[PDB]
Amino acid sequence: RDSEYLLQENEPDATLDQQLLEDLQKKKTDLRYIEMQRFREKLPSYGMQKELVNMIDNHQVTVISGETGCGKTTQVTQFILDNYIERGKGSACRIVCTQPRRISAISVAERVAAERAESCGNGNSTGYQIRLQSRLPRKQGSILYCTTGIILQWLQSDPHLSSVSHIVLDEIHERNLQSDVLMTVVKDLLSYRPDLKVVLMSATLNAEKFSEYFGNCPMIHIPGFTFPVVEYLLEDIIEKIRYVPEQQEKYYYEAIYKERWPGYLRELRQRYSASTVDVVEMMDDEKVDLNLIAALIRYIVLEEEDGAILVFLPGWDNISTLHDLLMSQVMFKSDKFIIIPLHSLMPTVNQTQVFKRTPPGVRKIVIATNIAETSITIDDVVYVIDGGKIKETHFDTQNNISTMSAEWVSKANAKQRKGRAGRVQPGHCYHLYNSLRASLLDDYQLPEILRTPLEELCLQIKILRLGGIAHFLSRLMDPPSNEAVLLSIKHLMELNALDKQEELTPLGVHLARLPVEPHIGKMILFGALFCCLDPVLTIAASLSFKDPFVIPLGKEKVADARRKELAKDTKSDHLTVVNAFKGWEKAKQRGFRYEKDYCWEYFLSSNTLQMLHNMKGQFAEHLLGAGFVSSRNPQDPESNINSDNEKIIKAVICAGLYPKVAKIRLNLGKKRKMVKVYTKTDGVVAIHPKSVNVEQTEFNYNWLIYHLKMRTSSIYLYDCTEVSPYCLLFFGGDISIQKDNDQETIAVDEWIIFQSPARIAHLVKELRKELDILLQEKIESPHPVDWKDTKSRDCAVLSAIIDLIKTQEK
Known part of the structure; x- marks a missing residue:
């Protein structure tokens, strides 16, 4: 499916070499092409054009470093292609460039196509390939942008990438799990592909680490920026806009902050107003001050020149909150503003906005997560507001609990966010951290492979049939601990994704093809197999990221009554989410007012519900690519024949949640206050409100399945459903x-x-x-x-x- 470009044969053609040379000379007489070349010549990469081409041509592996927006992503591929075309050998070029995200691969390919006065794909010189969507360029003398996940899938069809002549790994400093795997695979592939050219592109700092990893391959640095971007810290923001609000290793960094805090305020008074220093003193570091961001946006649109605004927030809850904060003001109600949220879990068509250039006098405001730290250009962005925080996963190998939280940004993320401005004109970057905080930020994020559960890592290593999992781990740039991998191996055996010999089962093969954690992947897979797709995807979407219920501190009693109403007699927190979601879907189409009244009465976040709706569509796309469903619609009738059968649904939940199994303890007393449990594997002992089954003194079965566990030493059960003893028998272990x-x-x-x-x-x-x-x-x-x-x-x-x-x- 997604291997169309890969499965082609690299066959150079002398007639097409002549056509490309003549077409390039014809381009040099086209007005629109000339104007694009004027922009390209302004990029720092343009001065290095001869040095970059000569070095890639003389060495198999090359490390290219440069500042954000220096031109690496959009120019290096063109320099290689145009050099071949000018030498009369353009057809010998089959260039593949990886991007970390699907929105990057699309927008970069569109921009490169536009810089060449061509449309994207359509058999032209430049195109892209992502999961289940492609605009493919011509066979020979072409550039293909894709995600690193696409290349990983390609390695299952051709582990040698035989038809690719150049592979360009972009944003390698972004040490995501897939990028580290691909990079290790490419290093092993070099000796098997002496004809392949590899280009590694990277932000200035630490670029030597990747050279050293690839055998001290030569490095070449692209110096400078295309345009200046002024940086403002928190004290500068408060001073400029006169804002008045409302008044293990990380542990020691906080002591340094607290120790230097009084002296920092003293020196801050010699440079800033006493009002702004008092505001800095009362700023809270636990959450992003979204009201401050709203006030800063107001100042920009009312006092600064035209230009789009790009806001970086940790997650979806902050994005929707800021979006509603702006839309509640009369100024932002008009069509003179277009406020666009940007989240990786949104559908691709919603993401393909943000790129259309804004017309004069209309202000575009993009509210994004770190998805916009990469080339999501555009860029008519002039103002970048860096909330100073980023959502990070942190996995404790003890208790086997992963925690997602808003952490302080690293200096690299800040530099990438600042770089989003200044791509076409001078810009401004506002960082919501003070100068003292800036001195205590890390240079880079911890690589994701060192701080997340590694079940997807092991499935990925196994599915590509590269080597043993032990040898491949040792070849990684930053190998994770052995204890973390054994826990993943143990977990994959309990899911029956691996057998006793640490080998992939048939189920493990399909799970390795689903780009989610295997516990979720096993649930949606069996939701497709048992034809109960829609309610299972809703449940799977709520187990990651979160349930839609929001229970204030005093409203436990009333919220419980509203939850037991939605639970009916299912005795299932997960089916309660299904019923809440279904009631919201009805209230949503009955007017925006009904939707708010429905969410308020049942203590529901309509913003979380919308996220669950987006993720359901993404899960269905995953199952379509894996061939388990016939369409992208979670409510397709062909996959929902059993969606009204609670027993089949509960079995699918058990298929996904095993081995998180709990046995109910029966007290001989008639009046059992709450339910006693023990799991023997965690070991939980109690069930936590607001669980539907807290006060349940009438269970049909003596076994519960659960998912969420709390990091606190006290072991609670957040959500649970009663499960049949035969579900555990079939979907269980030995x-x-x-x-x-x-x-x-x-x-x-x-x-x-x-x-x-x-x-x-x-x-x-x-x-x-x-x-x-x-x-x-x-x-x-x-x-x-x-x-x-x-x-x-x-x-x-x-x-x-x-x-x-x-x-x-x-």
Whole structure:
């Protein structure tokens, strides 16, 4: 599907070499092309054109460093292609350039195409490829921008990337998980592709680290900026706009801050007004001051010249909050402003705004996360407001709990955010951290591979059939600890994504093709297999990032009553989210006023709900690319035949949430205040309000599945549903028969004991085996399970599993 460009053959043609040379000379007489060349000559990269081309041509691996917007992303590919065209060998060029995000690959390809007076794709010189969407350029003498995830998928079809002549790894300083994997794969590939050219592009600082990693390959630095960008710190912002508000290693950095705090304020009084110093003193460092950002936006639009504004906020909750804060003011209601949120989980079509140039006198305001730190140009942006924070994952190998929080930005993220301005004219960057904070920021973020769960890392290593997982880890630039990888290996075995021999099962292959964590991937996969797609995607969307319920400090009683109403008799916090989501979808189409009244009455965040709606569409796209559904619509009827069956849904939840399994403790007393639990694997002992099942003294089964755990030593259960004992039997771990004696019992993972006929254990072993055969046949050419067949081997297997799950027995 996405391998169309890769699977082509690199076959240079002398006739096309002559056509490209003549076309280039014709371009040099075209007005629109000349004006683009005028802009290109202003870029710092243009002065280095001969040095860059000569160095890439003389060395297999090259490290190029330069400031943000120096021109690396849009120019280096063109310098390679145009040099080949001018030498009469343009058709020998098949250049692939990676971007960290899909919006970058699209916008950079459109910009390069425009710089060449061409449309993007359509068999022209430049195009892009992302998941399930492409504008492909011609076969030979072409440039293809894509995401690093696209190249990783390509390595499954051709581990040598045989038809690619140049591969340009951009933003390598952004040490994301996929980029570190790809970079290690490229390093191993060099000896197998002596004809391949590799270009590494990187921000000035620490660029030597990547040279050293690739055998001390030569480096070349592009100096300078195209335009100046003035930097303002928090004290400068408050002074300029006269703002008046309302009045382990990180632990020691805070002590340094607290120790230097009084002396910093003293020196701050010699340079700034006493009013602004008092405001800095009362600024809170735990959250971004969105009211300050709103006041700064007002000042820019009312006092500064035309130019778009780009705001960097940690996450979606801040973006929607600021968006509503602006839209509640009369000034921003008019069409003289266009306020555009930007989030990676938004649909691609919503993201493709922000690029259309604003007409004179109209102010564009983009509210983004760190997705906009990369080339999402545009750029008619003149003003950058850096909230000073970034959403980071932090994984504690103990308790196996990952925490997402708004951390202080690194100096690299700040420089990337400042660089978004000054791409076409002088700009301004406003940082919402004070000068003392700036001195205590890190140079770079910790690489993501050192601070996240590594289940996707191991699936990725395994699916590409490169080497053993131990040898590949040792080849990474920054290898993670062995204990973190074993925990991921252990988790993948409990999900049955790996077998006992640490080898991929058929399920693990499909999970490795889904770009989400395997627990979520297994849930949406079985939501597609069991034809209960829509409610499962809603549940999967709420397990990451969060549930839509917002319970103020005093409203627990009333909110619980509203939640038990939405729970009906499901005894399931996850189906409560389904019912809340469904009620919101109805109230949303009945006018914006009904939507607000519905969310207020049931203690719901309409902003979180909209995010859940966006993520459901992204999950369906993932299943489409993996061949498990026939369309991108989560409510497609062909994937929702069983969406009204609570038993099948609860089984799919269990398929995703195992081994997070909890046993209910029954108290002999009739009046049981709350429910006693124990999980033996965490080990939780209590269930936390506002859980629907807090006061439930009438459970149908003695087993619960859960997801969220709290980092505090006290072990709570945030959400849970009662699960059938046969769901744990089928979707669980190892099965065993035990004698009482004179009474046969079944065990799942030793600790889950049941009073069932012993032959059920043999049945589950056979149904698990049939399920593997079903998934194995899906590996070659994946197709959805055609449920209308009924008299099919795949439908009989899934029906037998569903029939076993649909069993009421305890």
